[PDB]
Design a protein around this ligand. Structure first.
Ligand SMILES: *[C@@H]1O[C@H](CO)[C@@H](O[C@@H]2O[C@H](CO)[C@@H](O)[C@H](O)[C@H]2NC(C)=O)[C@H](O)[C@H]1NC(C)=O
Ligand SMILES: *[C@@H]1O[C@H](CO)[C@@H](O[C@@H]2O[C@H](CO)[C@@H](O)[C@H](O)[C@H]2NC(C)=O)[C@H](O)[C@H]1NC(C)=O
Ligand code: CU
Ligand code: CU
Ligand code: CU
Length: 497
Protein backbone atom coordinates (compact mmCIF):
# COMPACT_ATOMS: atom_id res chain seq x y z
CA UNK A 1 0.00 0.00 0.00
CA UNK A 2 0.91 3.65 -0.57
CA UNK A 3 0.63 5.90 2.49
CA UNK A 4 -0.32 9.54 2.80
CA UNK A 5 -0.90 12.31 2.20
CA UNK A 6 -1.52 12.35 5.99
CA UNK A 7 0.49 9.60 7.69
CA UNK A 8 2.83 8.68 10.47
CA UNK A 9 6.27 7.45 9.37
CA UNK A 10 8.49 5.64 11.87
CA UNK A 11 12.26 5.65 11.41
CA UNK A 12 13.85 2.54 12.92
CA UNK A 13 16.92 0.39 12.94
CA UNK A 14 16.68 -3.19 11.68
CA UNK A 15 18.72 -5.84 9.92
CA UNK A 16 18.12 -6.35 6.22
CA UNK A 17 19.68 -8.60 3.60
CA UNK A 18 18.63 -7.19 0.18
CA UNK A 19 21.53 -8.95 -1.60
CA UNK A 20 21.87 -11.89 0.80
CA UNK A 21 24.33 -10.06 3.13
CA UNK A 22 22.89 -9.04 6.52
CA UNK A 23 23.59 -5.58 7.90
CA UNK A 24 21.84 -3.07 10.12
CA UNK A 25 20.03 -0.19 8.44
CA UNK A 26 18.06 3.02 8.96
CA UNK A 27 14.55 2.40 7.60
CA UNK A 28 11.36 4.32 7.02
CA UNK A 29 8.26 2.20 7.41
CA UNK A 30 10.28 -0.92 8.18
CA UNK A 31 11.41 -1.56 4.61
CA UNK A 32 14.07 -0.80 2.05
CA UNK A 33 13.21 1.26 0.14
CA UNK A 34 10.67 2.92 2.36
CA UNK A 35 6.96 2.88 1.51
CA UNK A 36 5.66 5.14 -1.22
CA UNK A 37 4.23 8.40 0.12
CA UNK A 38 1.52 9.59 -2.28
CA UNK A 39 -1.24 12.07 -2.85
CA UNK A 40 -2.71 14.29 -5.55
CA UNK A 41 -1.50 17.63 -6.84
CA UNK A 42 -2.32 20.43 -4.42
CA UNK A 43 -2.82 18.13 -1.48
CA UNK A 44 -1.79 18.88 2.09
CA UNK A 45 0.86 16.37 3.18
CA UNK A 46 1.30 15.88 6.90
CA UNK A 47 4.05 13.34 7.43
CA UNK A 48 4.56 12.91 11.16
CA UNK A 49 8.05 11.46 11.38
CA UNK A 50 8.76 9.42 14.52
CA UNK A 51 12.48 9.07 15.19
CA UNK A 52 12.85 5.69 16.89
CA UNK A 53 16.55 5.24 16.10
CA UNK A 54 18.80 3.73 18.78
CA UNK A 55 21.95 2.60 16.95
CA UNK A 56 24.58 5.40 17.00
CA UNK A 57 26.63 3.73 14.27
CA UNK A 58 24.15 5.17 11.75
CA UNK A 59 23.28 8.31 13.81
CA UNK A 60 20.29 8.43 16.15
CA UNK A 61 19.21 11.87 14.95
CA UNK A 62 17.37 12.29 11.63
CA UNK A 63 15.84 14.81 9.25
CA UNK A 64 13.85 14.08 6.07
CA UNK A 65 13.74 15.99 2.80
CA UNK A 66 10.98 15.75 0.19
CA UNK A 67 13.11 15.89 -2.93
CA UNK A 68 11.80 18.11 -5.69
CA UNK A 69 8.84 19.60 -3.75
CA UNK A 70 9.16 23.37 -3.71
CA UNK A 71 8.04 24.05 -0.12
CA UNK A 72 6.85 27.56 -0.98
CA UNK A 73 5.96 29.26 2.32
CA UNK A 74 7.09 26.14 4.22
CA UNK A 75 10.89 26.37 3.97
CA UNK A 76 11.02 25.05 7.57
CA UNK A 77 9.64 21.70 6.33
CA UNK A 78 12.28 21.17 3.61
CA UNK A 79 14.52 18.90 5.73
CA UNK A 80 18.25 19.63 5.04
CA UNK A 81 19.97 19.48 8.41
CA UNK A 82 21.42 22.81 9.54
CA UNK A 83 19.97 24.55 6.48
CA UNK A 84 16.24 24.55 7.34
CA UNK A 85 16.10 22.72 10.70
CA UNK A 86 17.96 21.07 13.50
CA UNK A 87 17.60 17.26 13.38
CA UNK A 88 14.83 15.40 15.18
CA UNK A 89 16.25 13.59 18.20
CA UNK A 90 15.49 10.01 19.10
CA UNK A 91 12.24 9.44 20.95
CA UNK A 92 10.66 12.55 19.41
CA UNK A 93 8.49 13.20 16.39
CA UNK A 94 7.88 16.08 13.98
CA UNK A 95 5.05 16.88 11.61
CA UNK A 96 6.25 17.91 8.14
CA UNK A 97 3.09 19.79 7.19
CA UNK A 98 3.20 21.25 3.68
CA UNK A 99 1.26 21.55 0.43
CA UNK A 100 2.14 20.66 -3.18
CA UNK A 101 0.40 23.31 -5.30
CA UNK A 102 1.28 23.29 -8.99
CA UNK A 103 3.35 20.11 -8.90
CA UNK A 104 2.53 16.59 -10.11
CA UNK A 105 5.03 13.89 -10.93
CA UNK A 106 7.57 11.52 -9.50
CA UNK A 107 9.61 12.55 -6.44
CA UNK A 108 11.32 10.81 -3.50
CA UNK A 109 12.13 11.33 0.15
CA UNK A 110 15.41 10.74 1.93
CA UNK A 111 17.34 11.50 5.07
CA UNK A 112 19.14 14.82 4.74
CA UNK A 113 21.50 14.39 7.72
CA UNK A 114 25.09 13.40 6.94
CA UNK A 115 25.26 10.26 4.73
CA UNK A 116 22.36 8.63 6.57
CA UNK A 117 20.18 8.12 3.49
CA UNK A 118 22.80 5.69 2.23
CA UNK A 119 22.10 3.55 5.32
CA UNK A 120 18.52 3.07 4.08
CA UNK A 121 16.24 6.06 4.65
CA UNK A 122 15.02 6.56 1.06
CA UNK A 123 11.70 5.95 -0.64
CA UNK A 124 9.40 7.10 -3.47
CA UNK A 125 7.05 10.09 -3.24
CA UNK A 126 4.39 10.36 -5.98
CA UNK A 127 2.07 13.30 -6.61
CA UNK A 128 -0.63 12.09 -9.04
CA UNK A 129 -2.54 14.39 -11.42
CA UNK A 130 -6.26 13.59 -11.67
CA UNK A 131 -6.27 15.57 -14.93
CA UNK A 132 -2.82 14.40 -16.14
CA UNK A 133 -2.29 15.55 -19.73
CA UNK A 134 -0.42 12.28 -20.33
CA UNK A 135 -3.20 10.04 -18.94
CA UNK A 136 -4.26 8.61 -22.31
CA UNK A 137 -0.74 7.34 -23.06
CA UNK A 138 -0.99 4.39 -20.63
CA UNK A 139 -3.35 2.03 -18.87
CA UNK A 140 -1.66 1.28 -15.52
CA UNK A 141 0.06 3.70 -13.08
CA UNK A 142 0.26 2.53 -9.46
CA UNK A 143 2.64 1.25 -6.84
CA UNK A 144 3.51 -1.73 -9.06
CA UNK A 145 4.88 0.58 -11.80
CA UNK A 146 7.44 2.39 -9.60
CA UNK A 147 11.03 1.24 -10.29
CA UNK A 148 13.68 2.31 -7.79
CA UNK A 149 17.42 2.07 -8.52
CA UNK A 150 19.67 1.98 -5.46
CA UNK A 151 23.28 1.50 -4.55
CA UNK A 152 23.81 -0.65 -1.48
CA UNK A 153 26.91 -0.87 0.72
CA UNK A 154 28.04 -3.59 3.14
CA UNK A 155 30.11 -1.03 5.09
CA UNK A 156 28.01 1.42 7.14
CA UNK A 157 28.08 5.01 5.87
CA UNK A 158 29.65 6.46 9.02
CA UNK A 159 32.25 3.65 8.97
CA UNK A 160 33.57 4.25 5.43
CA UNK A 161 37.27 4.74 6.14
CA UNK A 162 38.82 8.12 5.60
CA UNK A 163 41.22 7.85 2.63
CA UNK A 164 39.91 4.74 0.86
CA UNK A 165 37.72 4.70 -2.27
CA UNK A 166 34.00 4.22 -1.65
CA UNK A 167 32.09 1.89 -3.98
CA UNK A 168 28.90 -0.02 -3.55
CA UNK A 169 28.50 -3.76 -3.10
CA UNK A 170 25.20 -4.29 -4.93
CA UNK A 171 22.70 -2.63 -7.24
CA UNK A 172 19.18 -2.99 -5.91
CA UNK A 173 16.17 -2.66 -8.23
CA UNK A 174 12.94 -2.39 -6.21
CA UNK A 175 15.01 -3.29 -3.14
CA UNK A 176 16.58 -6.54 -4.43
CA UNK A 177 19.70 -7.47 -6.31
CA UNK A 178 22.91 -9.44 -6.08
CA UNK A 179 26.30 -8.58 -4.61
CA UNK A 180 29.23 -7.77 -6.89
CA UNK A 181 31.62 -9.97 -4.94
CA UNK A 182 30.76 -13.19 -3.12
CA UNK A 183 27.68 -13.21 -5.34
CA UNK A 184 24.85 -15.40 -4.13
CA UNK A 185 21.67 -16.28 -5.98
CA UNK A 186 19.46 -14.17 -3.78
CA UNK A 187 16.03 -13.23 -5.11
CA UNK A 188 15.69 -10.73 -7.95
CA UNK A 189 12.85 -8.26 -8.25
CA UNK A 190 10.07 -9.08 -10.70
CA UNK A 191 8.05 -6.42 -12.48
CA UNK A 192 4.89 -7.97 -13.92
CA UNK A 193 3.07 -6.75 -17.04
CA UNK A 194 0.11 -8.02 -19.08
CA UNK A 195 0.54 -8.46 -22.85
CA UNK A 196 -1.17 -5.62 -24.69
CA UNK A 197 -1.28 -3.08 -21.87
CA UNK A 198 0.73 0.10 -21.46
CA UNK A 199 2.38 1.11 -18.17
CA UNK A 200 3.58 4.40 -16.71
CA UNK A 201 6.87 3.22 -15.27
CA UNK A 202 8.11 5.75 -12.71
CA UNK A 203 11.88 5.33 -12.64
CA UNK A 204 13.46 6.77 -9.50
CA UNK A 205 17.17 6.96 -8.77
CA UNK A 206 17.53 6.79 -5.02
CA UNK A 207 21.30 6.49 -5.45
CA UNK A 208 23.87 7.85 -3.02
CA UNK A 209 26.46 7.90 -5.84
CA UNK A 210 26.45 5.96 -9.12
CA UNK A 211 24.59 6.78 -12.25
CA UNK A 212 22.91 3.86 -13.99
CA UNK A 213 22.53 2.85 -17.63
CA UNK A 214 18.96 1.53 -17.44
CA UNK A 215 17.38 -0.64 -20.15
CA UNK A 216 14.89 -3.43 -20.65
CA UNK A 217 15.81 -6.18 -23.11
CA UNK A 218 13.51 -6.28 -26.12
CA UNK A 219 11.69 -3.11 -25.17
CA UNK A 220 11.95 0.58 -25.64
CA UNK A 221 10.79 3.34 -23.33
CA UNK A 222 8.84 6.50 -24.14
CA UNK A 223 9.77 9.29 -21.73
CA UNK A 224 6.86 11.50 -20.65
CA UNK A 225 8.17 13.10 -17.43
CA UNK A 226 11.60 14.36 -16.25
CA UNK A 227 12.09 15.20 -12.54
CA UNK A 228 8.40 16.15 -12.14
CA UNK A 229 8.17 18.04 -15.44
CA UNK A 230 5.94 16.64 -18.18
CA UNK A 231 7.85 16.13 -21.42
CA UNK A 232 7.03 15.59 -25.03
CA UNK A 233 7.18 11.87 -25.83
CA UNK A 234 10.79 10.77 -26.42
CA UNK A 235 11.42 7.12 -27.31
CA UNK A 236 14.75 5.69 -26.14
CA UNK A 237 16.19 2.23 -25.58
CA UNK A 238 18.56 3.19 -22.71
CA UNK A 239 18.39 5.86 -20.00
CA UNK A 240 21.50 7.11 -18.21
CA UNK A 241 19.97 8.23 -14.90
CA UNK A 242 22.02 10.19 -12.36
CA UNK A 243 21.57 10.21 -8.58
CA UNK A 244 18.22 11.65 -7.50
CA UNK A 245 16.75 12.01 -11.02
CA UNK A 246 13.38 10.61 -12.07
CA UNK A 247 11.74 9.72 -15.35
CA UNK A 248 8.36 8.40 -16.23
CA UNK A 249 8.34 6.27 -19.35
CA UNK A 250 5.62 4.37 -21.11
CA UNK A 251 6.38 0.66 -21.37
CA UNK A 252 4.25 -1.01 -24.02
CA UNK A 253 3.95 -4.73 -23.18
CA UNK A 254 4.24 -5.47 -26.91
CA UNK A 255 6.81 -8.28 -26.95
CA UNK A 256 6.06 -12.03 -26.84
CA UNK A 257 4.87 -13.33 -23.51
CA UNK A 258 8.10 -14.19 -21.72
CA UNK A 259 10.84 -13.01 -19.38
CA UNK A 260 13.12 -10.08 -20.19
CA UNK A 261 16.13 -8.74 -18.27
CA UNK A 262 15.86 -5.32 -16.68
CA UNK A 263 19.37 -3.87 -16.57
CA UNK A 264 20.82 -1.09 -14.38
CA UNK A 265 24.59 -0.75 -14.93
CA UNK A 266 26.28 1.57 -12.38
CA UNK A 267 29.28 3.63 -13.45
CA UNK A 268 31.31 2.23 -10.53
CA UNK A 269 31.15 -1.11 -8.76
CA UNK A 270 30.40 -4.32 -10.60
CA UNK A 271 30.54 -4.21 -14.39
CA UNK A 272 28.28 -6.49 -16.36
CA UNK A 273 25.64 -8.98 -15.31
CA UNK A 274 27.49 -12.15 -14.30
CA UNK A 275 25.47 -14.15 -11.77
CA UNK A 276 22.57 -11.79 -12.20
CA UNK A 277 24.12 -8.67 -10.69
CA UNK A 278 22.74 -5.32 -11.89
CA UNK A 279 19.52 -7.09 -12.89
CA UNK A 280 15.80 -7.52 -12.36
CA UNK A 281 13.14 -9.42 -14.33
CA UNK A 282 10.29 -8.13 -16.49
CA UNK A 283 7.76 -11.01 -16.49
CA UNK A 284 4.63 -11.13 -18.63
CA UNK A 285 1.55 -12.72 -17.15
CA UNK A 286 1.45 -16.32 -18.34
CA UNK A 287 5.24 -16.59 -18.77
CA UNK A 288 7.14 -19.47 -17.24
CA UNK A 289 8.67 -18.63 -13.83
CA UNK A 290 12.30 -18.69 -14.91
CA UNK A 291 15.08 -16.24 -15.60
CA UNK A 292 15.19 -14.37 -18.88
CA UNK A 293 17.47 -15.60 -21.62
CA UNK A 294 17.62 -12.29 -23.45
CA UNK A 295 20.74 -10.20 -24.12
CA UNK A 296 21.43 -6.51 -24.46
CA UNK A 297 22.74 -5.19 -27.76
CA UNK A 298 26.43 -4.34 -28.00
CA UNK A 299 25.46 -0.76 -28.85
CA UNK A 300 22.11 0.85 -27.95
CA UNK A 301 20.24 2.42 -30.84
CA UNK A 302 18.57 5.38 -29.16
CA UNK A 303 20.16 6.32 -25.87
CA UNK A 304 18.70 9.25 -23.97
CA UNK A 305 20.50 12.53 -24.73
CA UNK A 306 19.31 15.35 -22.46
CA UNK A 307 19.07 17.94 -25.25
CA UNK A 308 16.49 15.73 -26.99
CA UNK A 309 14.01 16.25 -24.13
CA UNK A 310 11.53 19.13 -24.31
CA UNK A 311 8.71 20.21 -21.99
CA UNK A 312 5.14 19.23 -22.86
CA UNK A 313 4.01 22.72 -21.89
CA UNK A 314 5.38 25.90 -23.38
CA UNK A 315 7.81 26.66 -20.54
CA UNK A 316 10.44 28.58 -22.51
CA UNK A 317 13.52 29.97 -20.76
CA UNK A 318 13.54 33.08 -18.55
CA UNK A 319 15.94 35.88 -19.35
CA UNK A 320 17.69 36.73 -22.58
CA UNK A 321 19.08 34.27 -25.14
CA UNK A 322 22.81 34.51 -24.45
CA UNK A 323 25.29 33.71 -21.69
CA UNK A 324 24.90 36.11 -18.80
CA UNK A 325 21.45 37.19 -20.04
CA UNK A 326 19.89 37.19 -16.58
CA UNK A 327 19.33 39.64 -13.74
CA UNK A 328 21.78 37.69 -11.53
CA UNK A 329 24.22 35.71 -13.70
CA UNK A 330 26.54 33.49 -11.69
CA UNK A 331 29.44 31.20 -12.57
CA UNK A 332 30.46 28.85 -9.77
CA UNK A 333 34.05 27.62 -9.34
CA UNK A 334 33.51 23.95 -8.45
CA UNK A 335 36.67 22.26 -7.20
CA UNK A 336 38.10 19.29 -5.30
CA UNK A 337 41.38 18.91 -3.47
CA UNK A 338 42.75 16.90 -0.58
CA UNK A 339 39.52 15.10 0.30
CA UNK A 340 37.25 18.18 0.23
CA UNK A 341 35.08 19.84 -2.34
CA UNK A 342 34.62 23.58 -2.58
CA UNK A 343 32.36 26.12 -4.24
CA UNK A 344 34.02 29.50 -4.90
CA UNK A 345 36.81 28.49 -2.63
CA UNK A 346 34.68 27.45 0.36
CA UNK A 347 34.00 23.86 1.48
CA UNK A 348 30.54 23.43 3.05
CA UNK A 349 30.56 22.45 6.73
CA UNK A 350 27.09 22.55 8.32
CA UNK A 351 26.62 25.42 10.81
CA UNK A 352 25.51 25.04 14.41
CA UNK A 353 22.46 27.28 13.96
CA UNK A 354 20.40 26.37 10.88
CA UNK A 355 20.55 28.99 8.16
CA UNK A 356 16.77 29.54 8.32
CA UNK A 357 16.91 30.14 12.09
CA UNK A 358 19.81 32.59 11.65
CA UNK A 359 17.63 34.56 9.19
CA UNK A 360 14.56 34.48 11.43
CA UNK A 361 16.70 35.76 14.31
CA UNK A 362 17.51 38.87 12.20
CA UNK A 363 20.68 38.11 10.25
CA UNK A 364 19.76 39.81 7.04
CA UNK A 365 22.66 39.66 4.69
CA UNK A 366 24.32 36.72 3.38
CA UNK A 367 27.79 37.92 4.46
CA UNK A 368 26.23 37.86 8.12
CA UNK A 369 25.22 34.18 7.65
CA UNK A 370 27.14 31.12 8.74
CA UNK A 371 28.93 29.29 7.37
CA UNK A 372 30.89 32.31 6.11
CA UNK A 373 31.22 32.24 2.34
CA UNK A 374 28.76 29.33 2.00
CA UNK A 375 25.56 31.42 1.85
CA UNK A 376 24.88 33.54 -1.24
CA UNK A 377 21.94 35.90 -1.40
CA UNK A 378 19.58 35.91 -4.37
CA UNK A 379 17.35 38.92 -5.13
CA UNK A 380 13.60 38.49 -5.35
CA UNK A 381 11.57 38.29 -8.53
CA UNK A 382 14.70 37.98 -10.66
CA UNK A 383 16.08 35.70 -13.37
CA UNK A 384 19.02 33.72 -12.01
CA UNK A 385 21.56 31.96 -14.22
CA UNK A 386 24.06 29.53 -12.70
CA UNK A 387 26.89 28.12 -14.81
CA UNK A 388 28.34 24.96 -13.26
CA UNK A 389 31.56 24.19 -15.23
CA UNK A 390 32.77 20.63 -14.64
CA UNK A 391 36.25 19.29 -14.03
CA UNK A 392 36.28 18.54 -10.30
CA UNK A 393 37.28 14.95 -9.54
CA UNK A 394 34.68 12.30 -8.92
CA UNK A 395 32.40 13.35 -11.81
CA UNK A 396 30.01 13.36 -13.43
CA UNK A 397 28.42 15.37 -10.61
CA UNK A 398 24.60 15.57 -10.46
CA UNK A 399 23.79 19.01 -9.06
CA UNK A 400 20.43 19.62 -7.39
CA UNK A 401 18.68 22.80 -6.23
CA UNK A 402 16.09 22.73 -3.44
CA UNK A 403 12.96 24.90 -3.67
CA UNK A 404 13.01 25.03 -7.47
CA UNK A 405 13.23 23.35 -10.78
CA UNK A 406 15.20 25.01 -13.56
CA UNK A 407 15.70 25.26 -17.29
CA UNK A 408 18.77 23.27 -18.40
CA UNK A 409 20.11 25.87 -20.82
CA UNK A 410 23.25 23.80 -21.47
CA UNK A 411 23.67 20.05 -20.97
CA UNK A 412 26.60 17.70 -20.56
CA UNK A 413 28.82 16.91 -23.50
CA UNK A 414 27.37 19.57 -25.83
CA UNK A 415 28.72 23.11 -25.96
CA UNK A 416 25.55 24.59 -27.51
CA UNK A 417 23.09 26.33 -25.18
CA UNK A 418 19.33 26.22 -25.75
CA UNK A 419 17.39 29.39 -24.91
CA UNK A 420 14.22 28.16 -26.64
CA UNK A 421 12.87 24.85 -25.39
CA UNK A 422 15.22 22.94 -23.08
CA UNK A 423 13.88 20.54 -20.53
CA UNK A 424 13.27 21.77 -17.00
CA UNK A 425 14.31 19.50 -14.14
CA UNK A 426 15.74 19.57 -10.59
CA UNK A 427 18.93 17.46 -10.73
CA UNK A 428 21.36 17.73 -13.66
CA UNK A 429 24.67 16.09 -14.53
CA UNK A 430 27.27 18.81 -15.00
CA UNK A 431 29.19 16.53 -17.36
CA UNK A 432 32.87 16.26 -18.10
CA UNK A 433 35.98 18.36 -18.33
CA UNK A 434 35.38 21.53 -20.37
CA UNK A 435 31.58 21.37 -20.10
CA UNK A 436 29.51 24.35 -19.03
CA UNK A 437 26.18 23.02 -17.85
CA UNK A 438 24.03 26.03 -17.03
CA UNK A 439 20.67 26.40 -15.31
CA UNK A 440 18.11 29.22 -15.08
CA UNK A 441 15.15 29.94 -12.81
CA UNK A 442 13.19 32.88 -11.40
CA UNK A 443 13.20 33.74 -7.70
CA UNK A 444 9.61 33.50 -6.47
CA UNK A 445 10.21 31.39 -3.36
CA UNK A 446 11.74 33.17 -0.35
CA UNK A 447 13.99 31.05 1.87
CA UNK A 448 17.37 29.34 2.10
CA UNK A 449 17.64 26.69 -0.62
CA UNK A 450 20.47 24.16 -0.70
CA UNK A 451 22.44 23.71 -3.97
CA UNK A 452 24.64 20.64 -3.91
CA UNK A 453 26.05 17.63 -5.62
CA UNK A 454 23.69 14.68 -5.02
CA UNK A 455 26.50 12.14 -4.69
CA UNK A 456 26.05 11.99 -0.95
CA UNK A 457 29.70 11.28 -0.25
CA UNK A 458 30.53 14.56 -2.07
CA UNK A 459 27.92 16.55 -0.16
CA UNK A 460 29.46 15.23 3.06
CA UNK A 461 32.88 16.33 1.76
CA UNK A 462 31.61 19.88 1.26
CA UNK A 463 30.21 20.17 -2.30
CA UNK A 464 27.38 22.60 -1.50
CA UNK A 465 26.30 26.21 -1.02
CA UNK A 466 23.07 27.76 0.24
CA UNK A 467 21.12 30.26 -1.87
CA UNK A 468 19.44 32.60 0.63
CA UNK A 469 16.64 33.62 -1.73
CA UNK A 470 14.92 36.90 -0.77
CA UNK A 471 16.30 37.18 2.75
CA UNK A 472 14.07 40.22 3.48
CA UNK A 473 10.84 38.32 2.89
CA UNK A 474 11.92 34.98 4.37
CA UNK A 475 10.33 35.53 7.80
CA UNK A 476 7.00 36.89 6.53
CA UNK A 477 6.78 34.19 3.84
CA UNK A 478 7.57 31.20 6.07
CA UNK A 479 5.70 31.33 9.43
CA UNK A 480 7.04 28.54 11.60
CA UNK A 481 5.13 26.14 13.89
CA UNK A 482 6.03 25.78 17.55
CA UNK A 483 7.31 22.25 16.97
CA UNK A 484 9.89 23.61 14.52
CA UNK A 485 10.97 26.29 17.01
CA UNK A 486 11.42 23.50 19.57
CA UNK A 487 13.82 21.46 17.39
CA UNK A 488 17.09 23.30 17.95
CA UNK A 489 16.69 23.73 21.74
CA UNK A 490 15.94 19.99 22.03
CA UNK A 491 18.81 19.00 19.72
CA UNK A 492 21.35 21.27 21.33
CA UNK A 493 20.34 20.06 24.85
CA UNK A 494 20.61 16.40 23.82
CA UNK A 495 24.06 16.96 22.28
CA UNK A 496 25.36 19.43 24.93
CA UNK A 497 25.77 22.25 22.39
C1 LIG B 1 30.66 29.14 -18.70
O1 LIG B 1 29.79 30.19 -19.09
C2 LIG B 1 30.03 31.37 -18.31
C3 LIG B 1 28.94 32.40 -18.62
O2 LIG B 1 27.64 31.86 -18.40
C4 LIG B 1 31.44 31.91 -18.61
O3 LIG B 1 31.64 33.07 -17.81
C5 LIG B 1 32.41 34.07 -18.28
O4 LIG B 1 33.78 33.79 -17.89
C6 LIG B 1 34.75 34.74 -18.35
C7 LIG B 1 36.12 34.22 -17.87
O5 LIG B 1 36.29 32.82 -18.14
C8 LIG B 1 34.37 36.13 -17.81
O6 LIG B 1 35.18 37.10 -18.45
C9 LIG B 1 32.88 36.52 -18.05
O7 LIG B 1 32.52 37.71 -17.32
C10 LIG B 1 31.91 35.39 -17.69
N1 LIG B 1 30.46 35.65 -18.05
C11 LIG B 1 29.93 35.92 -19.28
C12 LIG B 1 30.76 36.15 -20.51
O8 LIG B 1 28.72 36.00 -19.50
C13 LIG B 1 32.47 30.84 -18.31
O9 LIG B 1 33.78 31.19 -18.78
C14 LIG B 1 32.10 29.53 -18.98
N2 LIG B 1 33.00 28.47 -18.51
C15 LIG B 1 33.50 27.52 -19.27
C16 LIG B 1 34.47 26.55 -18.62
O10 LIG B 1 33.22 27.37 -20.47
C1 LIG C 1 23.46 19.96 -28.84
O1 LIG C 1 22.57 20.85 -28.18
C2 LIG C 1 21.87 21.69 -29.08
C3 LIG C 1 21.07 22.69 -28.28
O2 LIG C 1 20.13 22.04 -27.42
C4 LIG C 1 21.02 20.86 -30.03
O3 LIG C 1 20.54 21.75 -31.05
C5 LIG C 1 19.23 21.74 -31.35
O4 LIG C 1 19.01 20.64 -32.25
C6 LIG C 1 17.64 20.51 -32.57
C7 LIG C 1 17.48 19.19 -33.29
O5 LIG C 1 18.17 19.15 -34.55
C8 LIG C 1 17.16 21.73 -33.39
O6 LIG C 1 15.74 21.72 -33.53
C9 LIG C 1 17.43 23.01 -32.59
O7 LIG C 1 17.19 24.17 -33.41
C10 LIG C 1 18.86 23.04 -32.08
N1 LIG C 1 19.02 24.22 -31.19
C11 LIG C 1 20.11 24.94 -31.20
C12 LIG C 1 20.13 26.11 -30.25
O8 LIG C 1 21.06 24.76 -31.95
C13 LIG C 1 21.82 19.72 -30.66
O9 LIG C 1 20.99 18.81 -31.38
C14 LIG C 1 22.65 18.96 -29.65
N2 LIG C 1 23.55 18.03 -30.31
C15 LIG C 1 23.35 16.71 -30.37
C16 LIG C 1 24.42 15.93 -31.10
O10 LIG C 1 22.36 16.15 -29.86
CU1 CU D 1 15.94 18.41 -2.89
CU1 CU E 1 29.74 15.05 -6.87
CU1 CU F 1 19.21 17.96 -1.05
Amino acid sequence: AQIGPVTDLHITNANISPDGFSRPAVLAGGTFPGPTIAGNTGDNFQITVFNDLTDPSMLTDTSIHWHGLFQKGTNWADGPAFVTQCPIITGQSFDYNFNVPGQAGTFWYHSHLSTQYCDGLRGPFVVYDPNDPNASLYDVDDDTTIITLADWYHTLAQQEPIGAAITADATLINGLGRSFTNTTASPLSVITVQSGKRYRMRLVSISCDPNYLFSIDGHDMTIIEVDGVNSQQLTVDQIQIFAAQRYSFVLNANQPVGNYWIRAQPNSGGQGFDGGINSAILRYEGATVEDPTTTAPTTFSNPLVETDLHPLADLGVPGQPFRGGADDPLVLNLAFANGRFSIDGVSFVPPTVPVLLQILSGAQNAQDLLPAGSVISLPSNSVIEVALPAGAAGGPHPFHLHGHNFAVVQSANNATPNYVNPIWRDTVSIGGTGDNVTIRFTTNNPGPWFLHCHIDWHLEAGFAIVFAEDIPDTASANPVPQAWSDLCPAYDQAHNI
